[PDB]
Symmetry: C2
Subunit: 130 residues, 2 copies
């Protein structure tokens, strides 16, 4: 089986800055799953960040965790089987390994429990210094 | 919630060589979950390597993927809440990011479906040189 999920982006930024993550999924996984982002801060379990689900036509439904609401924007492009996370007004508290996630059972973007995730990316470090 | 699983060890070895990896689990997960190891080779999805029965102290079952049978061995140290993956007679085809995993819905070592895994480690690169 070929790798389902591959993240790109990540790196070192300063407080206030923006950084974009993206991830590709195989066509089958992309079309069959609610796609999401998680983050694992130092010493902590991976926590839900945002999710996005396809709706009829060009439509998408998006759902964000309270901690990142407003500051982050999630999006997807089915022509490229890619999901994007644009992070803005980044703070030290946002420092983490960020993971893309796919849940094949969910149909509509909602809070995703990490324990229910079917496929994960390899993780990508984002560091925000004061 | 604290991180549940943390790998240690890894690197580059030569074909024919050996390497043991370790991972710490929280007290709760060590007691309650089947723990195991997966690996993700470049461009391939993560595949099952080995599993050990929940709460492995005095006695446990161990179970292995056919590809690593006899060469690989899994074990534990209950006193340090640690699981080990011993890899003998390493081959270039064993090159991968290796991940520890735990499944709270399993009690006896067995094939672990990546889709059912509750908690994941961060992964560690193991390269086997030709």
């Amino acid at each position: 089986m070929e790798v389902q999920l591959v993240e790109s982006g990540g790196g070192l930024v300063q407080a206030g800055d923006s950084l974009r993550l993206s991830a590709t999924a195989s066509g089958r996984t992309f079309s069959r799953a609610v796609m999401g982002w998680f983050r694992q801060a130092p010493g902590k379990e991976r926590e839900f960040v945002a999710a996005i689900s396809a709706a009829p036509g060009t439509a998408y439904y998006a759902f964000y965790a309270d901690s990142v609401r407003g500051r982050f924007s999630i999006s997807a492009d089915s022509a490229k089987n890619t999901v994007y996370l644009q992070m803005n007004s980044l703070k030290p508290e946002d420092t983490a390994v960020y993971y893309v996630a796919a849940d094949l059972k969910m149909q509509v973007a909602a809070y995703m429990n990490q324990r229910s995730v079917d496929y994960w990316g390899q993780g990508t470090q984002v560091t925000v210094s004061s």
